[PDB]
Design a protein around this ligand. Structure first.
Ligand SMILES: *[C@@H]1O[C@H](CO)[C@@H](O[C@@H]2O[C@H](CO)[C@@H](O)[C@H](O)[C@H]2NC(C)=O)[C@H](O)[C@H]1NC(C)=O
Lengths: 48, 48
């Protein structure tokens, strides 16, 4: 969990990594609004 | 003649568990499958 060069070593299970490219980590994108929501009214009930 | 198919890649732990820490925890018992499963695709990927 230190940093990407380290997390690479967490994959190949080697303290030495050959030069190249390595699919390393489970990247993700996040939501930032826990929105609770609804629609657009018109016709109310007359208890009058 | 064809030359190469689309370089598909999947991450098991996402595909197997769409971010459910309970799910991944059980999977880890299965060991190196979803390392090697990932690996072969990359082997497929690079070979393209
Ligand atoms: C949905 O509710 C809105 C009130 O929030 C109604 O009021 C407006 O109606 C006018 C004319 O149609 C629109 O130009 C406005 O945009 C509506 N609201 C606002 C402030 O934008 C609206 O009529 C209702 N539904 C409909 C049929 O639009």
């Amino acid at each position: 969990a230190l940093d990407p060069l380290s997390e690479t070593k967490c994959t190949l299970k080697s303290f030495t990594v050959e030069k190249g490219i390595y699919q390393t980590s489970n990247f993700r994108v996040q939501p930032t609004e826990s929105i609770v929501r609804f629609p657009n009214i018109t016709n109310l009930c007359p208890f009058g | 003649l064809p030359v190469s198919m689309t370089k598909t890649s999947v991450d098991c732990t996402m595909y197997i568990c769409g971010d459910s820490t309970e799910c991944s925890n059980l999977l880890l018992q299965y060991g190196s499958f979803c390392t090697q499963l990932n690996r072969a695709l990359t082997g497929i990927a690079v070979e393209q």
